[PDB]
Amino acid sequence: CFMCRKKVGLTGFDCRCGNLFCGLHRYSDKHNCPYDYKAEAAAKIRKENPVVVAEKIQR
Amino acid sequence: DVLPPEADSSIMMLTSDQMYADIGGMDIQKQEVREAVELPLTHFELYKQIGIDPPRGVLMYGPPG
């Protein structure tokens, strides 16, 4: 239920700030969404990243 | 042991069915089928005498219905 429009629409899109934004004001650029999008990107990419170890080390 | 000739899945009771006299017309097919399969099975001598061998198989081919 975002301050602009005081919207309560069931369609309300519920963001990482848990807030059913106005249909037109659902974007972080618009509402200063206080979330660490870039930090989460770094963590996820580090987790999912494939690295070639060259398959030479052996017991 | 050698069982009686029969000993397999098939139909022999005829399940009854419906004596002719009811198909209606179709005289040509009636005569042909009756001769080929029905009586008189005696005319085999006429077949061999004429030299024309006994027909077997009819194939009854025609439009559906």
Partner: protein, 339 residues
Amino acid sequence: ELREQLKELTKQYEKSENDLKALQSVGQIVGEVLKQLTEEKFIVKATNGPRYVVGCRRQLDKSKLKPGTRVALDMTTLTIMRYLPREVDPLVYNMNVSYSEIGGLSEQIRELREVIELPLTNPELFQRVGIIPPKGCLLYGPPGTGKTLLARAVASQLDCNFLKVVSSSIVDKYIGESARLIREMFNYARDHQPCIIFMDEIDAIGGRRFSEGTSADREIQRTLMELLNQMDGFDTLHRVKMIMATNRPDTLDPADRKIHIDLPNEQARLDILKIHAGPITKHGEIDYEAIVKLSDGFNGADLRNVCTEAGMFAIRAVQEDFMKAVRKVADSKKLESKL
């Protein structure tokens, strides 16, 4: 708690002893007899495939069992223990409800009933002996005219056995068995003489008698051919009724009783929309005049759409809004525009 504890223990004893007794009864082998060989000798082809000759326990009334009857032979000696009736495994499936709650289809419902239900009723021939009433009916229908709902209604109305079957009966085990399933169906019906079999989507299997098409085409046409043979032919029926529902390109199945089902509706469109407005009154004006004036297609799901979205509207702010129902009418019609 003496009596209660004793009762509970006794119940446990009873159940446990019954279970132990149950655990000590091996099964049989199911197989159909083939010939009454002399008196105490029968040739039985066990379902697993081998064919045997065995003698039967005395208390079996040898007259009962006959070529084709099923029996349960024993494990070790394989003596006929108990004869069984016919067998139909994957058909409990084939055996909601509605009572003329569809709207329209007056003449066609009358025709279908008078062809499929009335003859089975007590007015069996009543001098009508000359008819041999029709054994099959067809339901020319575009996608949703009211075919499946009609089937539901007749199934709930007649109250006899019903076998709703679909062209998705095709199976393959490095060989064909569709015809075998078909003959199972027909045998089931013939045993349950009072019955309504209902093929639907006969287009697929009906196909066409394409020659040199492919192994698939030959198999499909063979399945069709089983249908034809068991509809007509030596499998002549007396008390079953067949239903079909698909488009025109169906091989060659004339005779019967084909009925056209028209997608548009004259004023039973108004009817259908009233039935679909059956949901709770809108708290005021109930006239449908708005949607009445313009209407095309065949569905009432427009009613569900309008009602749901108007409930959403009301929550945002009853639904006395036929001016709003015309909205979802326009929505369905734009879907029509799409196709």
